[PDB]
């Protein structure tokens, strides 16, 4: 009775969204950018190799000074690197070695990480004692922590395998907003440049746009054939890209509520673990299970270059805020800085 | 050479961090990492009780060999997105309850979970230590309910020795890479205090086989 009426209404509303999206797709991105020229071949060299992790590296995150980065490996370590000199600034022992994500707070004051312990730990990098200590243990998720990103010294957004995301008040250690709506594990987060919005990808092949303060899902973006492992915003905040197990990256527009472009090749059959944009948004970089990172022309879906040199799966990409360098991390326990 | 006074001190700090990281690496490289799997309500707690919210770790030593057992229970999330984290563990310890043969059938769920991990692409070179728990309850139950409840093809007596051996074999038959990994099977009960000895000898065998491969003798 009521259940059949409600489910029938949901399907009619799905039809209305699809028809509204078909109505907006008056042209493809490839038709608009057809004659914008070709970036050509982007050939990047390894400028730094950062040696020191011994286990698989699962995450890294650049600081806002474009010089420091944090990397997380299942040695039980976070290492804060001086990417210009390769010097290790801090080595932080973890209480749980099964770390899957880390984040470098925009201020440089805090670094976060966590993983299979379901806890996002906040470390204080700038203490009077001189060592790095845990300031908070953000417990409350019921599944592994897949991605965390800072908003401020007192705000962090997490996503976990319990299919939710949460906004945490770090000082009190509480969840102030819980973001529900995914049906599978949430794998990746990316914050909007203005950190009023964020997007997440999950193991239901959809990405969702979340309103940080309202707690609602504003948009759901479908199109992938398999789980989404990585997500990143386009630099102007009006678009984002995903990478999934189906070996395709996809660019989604927030305002047209529509998929713009797919990035794929017949010779790429393995999954994608990490995506990032260059400073102009013109290049879309993705790390693959085949140990390479591909550089896509974000406007043409051409392969602009290949960053080859890792001996195992690429686990994480990160581009500096000034665009000077690309960092890649891999299961071979090395980081590489490219330019 | 061209470094400032502070740059040299920063490099010295980095080198000391490298020293500490290598010492922790050498210590970790000598520890046995055991991944503990099993079906719900299986005798995992009986094993941990003898060996001693996400991952629950149990640390113990036996004959000067250190172990870390990683219980992934209550991590109720898609295995495909974290089970790869345990690639490289020395061995997997898997718990199956014999008393579930008469209870999808719980015994078939155990075989399906066993096959799912046993032939997983992440663990092709990782051996399994398979504990058949509650052998005493099983000995009593099998005398009243035949094993053909979960193995209709079973041909044999409704007694402990024949039915327990059949169940062991049925799990060993799930190994699709017999030339790459061994399965070490042990029958246990809540009062069996040799469980740690079973792990120690099985892990020692694994370490010797791994080093034979690594030394090139393969």
């Amino acid at each position, epitope marked *: 009775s009521e259940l059949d009426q409600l489910r029938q209404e949901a399907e009619q509303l799905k039809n209305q969204i699809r028809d509204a999206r078909k109505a907006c797709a008056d042209a493809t991105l490839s038709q608009i950018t057809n004659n914008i020229d070709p970036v050509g071949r982007i050939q990047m060299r390894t400028r730094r190799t950062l040696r020191g992790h011994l286990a698989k590296i699962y995450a890294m995150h650049w600081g806002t000074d474009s010089r420091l980065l944090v990397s997380a490996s299942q040695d039980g370590k976070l290492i804060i690197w001086d990417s210009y*000199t390769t010097n290790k600034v801090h080595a932080i022992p973890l209480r749980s070695s099964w770390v899957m994500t880390c984040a470098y707070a925009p201020s440089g004051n805090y670094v976060a990480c966590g993983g299979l312990d379901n806890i996002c730990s906040i470390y204080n990098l700038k203490t009077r004692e*001189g060592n790095v200590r845990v300031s908070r243990e953000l417990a409350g998720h019921t599944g592994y922590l897949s991605c965390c990103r800072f908003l401020d010294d007192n705000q962090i957004v997490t996503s976990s395998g319990d299919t939710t995301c949460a906004l945490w008040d770090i000082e009190t250690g509480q969840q102030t907003t819980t973001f529900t709506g995914h049906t599978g594990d949430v794998m990746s987060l990316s914050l909007a440049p203005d950190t009023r919005l964020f997007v997440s990808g999950a193991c239901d092949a959809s990405a969702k746009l979340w309103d940080v303060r309202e707690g609602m899902c504003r948009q759901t973006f479908t199109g992938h054939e398999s789980d989404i492992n990585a997500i990143c915003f386009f630099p102007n905040g009006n678009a984002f890209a995903t990478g999934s197990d189906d070996a395709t990256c996809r660019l989604f527009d927030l305002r047209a509520d529509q998929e713009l472009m797919t990035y794929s090749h017949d010779n790429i059959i393995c999954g994608i673990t990490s995506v990032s944009f260059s400073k102009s948004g013109r290049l879309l970089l993705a790390g693959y299970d085949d140990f390479n990172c591909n550089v896509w022309d974000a406007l043409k879906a051409d392969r602009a270059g290949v960053l080859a040199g890792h001996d195992n799966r690429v686990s994480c990409l990160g581009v500096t805020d000034d665009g000077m360098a690309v960092a890649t991390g891999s299961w071979d326990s090395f980081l590489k800085i490219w330019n | 050479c061209t470094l400032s*006074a502070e740059d040299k001190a920063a490099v010295e700090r980095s080198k000391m961090i490298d020293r500490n990281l290598r010492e922790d690496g050498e210590k970790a490289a000598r520890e046995v990492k055991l991944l503990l799997l099993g079906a719900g309500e299986s005798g995992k707690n009986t094993i941990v009780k003898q060996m001693k919210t996400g991952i629950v770790e149990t640390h113990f030593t036996f004959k000067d060999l250190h172990f870390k057992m990683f219980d992934v229970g209550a991590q109720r999330s898609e295995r495909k997105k974290w089970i790869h984290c345990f690639e490289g563990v020395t061995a997997i310890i898997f718990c199956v309850a014999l008393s579930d043969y008469d209870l999808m059938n719980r015994m078939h769920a155990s075989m399906k979970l066993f096959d799912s991990i046993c032939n997983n692409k992440w663990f092709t070179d990782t051996s399994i230590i398979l504990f058949l728990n509650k052998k005493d309850l099983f000995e009593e139950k099998i005398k009243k309910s035949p094993l053909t409840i979960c193995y209709p093809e079973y041909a044999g007596s409704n007694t402990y020795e024949e039915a327990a051996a059949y169940i062991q074999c049925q799990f060993e038959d799930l190994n699709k890479r017999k030339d790459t990994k061994e399965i070490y099977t042990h029958f246990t009960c809540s009062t069996d205090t040799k469980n740690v000895q079973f792990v120690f000898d099985a892990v020692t065998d694994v370490i010797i086989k791994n080093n034979l491969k690594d030394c090139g003798l393969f």
Partner: single-chain antibody, 231 residues
Framework: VQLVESGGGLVQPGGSRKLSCSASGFAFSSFGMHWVRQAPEKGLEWVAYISSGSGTIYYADTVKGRFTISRDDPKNTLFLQMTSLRSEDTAMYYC??????????????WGQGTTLTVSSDIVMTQATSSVPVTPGESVSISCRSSKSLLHSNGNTYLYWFLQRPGQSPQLLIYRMSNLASGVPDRFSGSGSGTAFTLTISRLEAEDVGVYYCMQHLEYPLTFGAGTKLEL
């Protein structure tokens, strides 16, 4: 965070004495330690450095072969073993912590000091020894270096310290422009690499004391004579 020096007192010329510095409240083993001494009517003189892990040790040319600096991390204690003491060694000796990494603030905490009584350097010039000041007004204190302190890495290695009438020196600014943690925002610094200014936008009575410049580009570390504010 405390550093408590002990072992001072009167020594006869040519004798020996060991000073101790008991560290508490911070990760002593992770810091490098310096000894800086101040003669009864003079400014700061750098004495010796021992790095974290005791890998690197430096001495000032004035104490080479006579002073030995050593570290005991298990007891969180720094030692200075002095032999053949001279009358010129009369000074209060301050135990100073210093941690080095990208973005660190070395020389940020000084101990209280213990009084010892005996019966191609970079020269830091502070031409003005005293400035009369009024609370509520700004004041500028200048320093010049005999050598450029701007390194090719982009950092300019000058430090500002304030020593109040009854206190050990406090770090104000590190690397020319970076304000030390806990120091009021009224302090700022800038410079060319050879000429530097400390700006105090509004002077308070709590800011009265002697301001020192230090260079940290090369060892030995050197201090300026120090500019006193008379309030």
């Amino acid at each position: 965070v405390q550093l408590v020096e002990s072992g001072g007192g009167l020594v006869q010329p040519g004798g020996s004495r060991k000073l101790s510095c008991s560290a508490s409240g911070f990760a002593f083993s992770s810091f490098g330690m310096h000894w800086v001494r101040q003669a009864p009517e003079k400014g700061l003189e750098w004495v010796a450095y021992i790095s974290s892990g005791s890998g690197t040790i430096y001495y000032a040319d004035t104490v080479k072969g006579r002073f030995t600096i050593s570290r005991d991390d298990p007891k969180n204690t720094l030692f200075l073993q002095m032999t053949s003491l001279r009358s010129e060694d009369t000074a209060m000796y301050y135990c100073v912590r210093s941690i080095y990494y990208y973005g660190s603030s070395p020389f940020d905490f000084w101990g209280q000091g213990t009084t010892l009584t005996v019966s191609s350097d970079i020269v830091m010039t502070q031409a003005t020894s005293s400035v009369p000041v009024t609370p509520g007004e700004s004041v500028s204190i200048s320093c010049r270096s005999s050598k450029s302190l701007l390194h090719s890495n982009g950092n300019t290695y000058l430090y500002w310290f304030l020593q109040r009438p009854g206190q050990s020196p406090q770090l104000l600014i590190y690397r020319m422009s970076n304000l030390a943690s806990g120091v009021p925002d009224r302090f700022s610094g800038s410079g060319s690499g050879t000429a530097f200014t400390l700006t105090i936008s509004r002077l308070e009575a709590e800011d009265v004391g002697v301001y020192y410049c230090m260079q940290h580009l090369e060892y030995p570390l050197t201090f300026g004579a120090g500019t006193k504010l008379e309030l």
